[PDB]
Design a protein around this nucleic acid. Structure first.
Length: 108
DNA sequence: GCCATGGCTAGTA
DNA sequence: GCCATGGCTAGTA
């Protein structure tokens, strides 16, 4: 499979995560049949434009935290979105935001 | 080509 | 560890 397809397949899968659930880079990656490709799902999400109607906020790492995402710390926005979805998050010592995976985890 | 740089993470320590 | 992108440079031609 070529990139650009992959992407389309990701976004498809991401568009499938239910309102108020979530998944992880890792899961998605395996979902679309390329388990080794977490990081890239990462990047697929990165490249989307704001105007997207693709649920990129519903994807976080396997440690139930909002991925660091150093460049453009304006990922604060991912938090907001997720709260208004009802999902409930808190911070940590060392900052970060985090939630209860077993609950919110989309178990397809 | 070799190398650093990422919204990573299963399995060690 | 895994793996794409993209910016350097040995060193072929």
């Amino acid at each position: 499979m070529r990139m650009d397809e992959f992407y389309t397949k990701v976004y498809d899968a991401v568009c499938e995560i239910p309102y108020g659930k979530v998944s992880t880079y890792g899961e998605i990656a395996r979902y679309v049949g390329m388990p080794s490709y977490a990081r890239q799902v990462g990047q697929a999400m990165k490249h989307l434009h704001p105007e997207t109607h693709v649920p990129w906020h519903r994807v976080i790492n396997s440690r139930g935290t909002i991925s660091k995402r150093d460049i453009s710390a304006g990922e604060q926005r991912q938090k907001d979105r997720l709260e208004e979805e009802g999902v409930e998050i808190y911070q940590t010592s060392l900052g970060e935001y985090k939630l209860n995976l077993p609950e919110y985890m989309w178990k397809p």
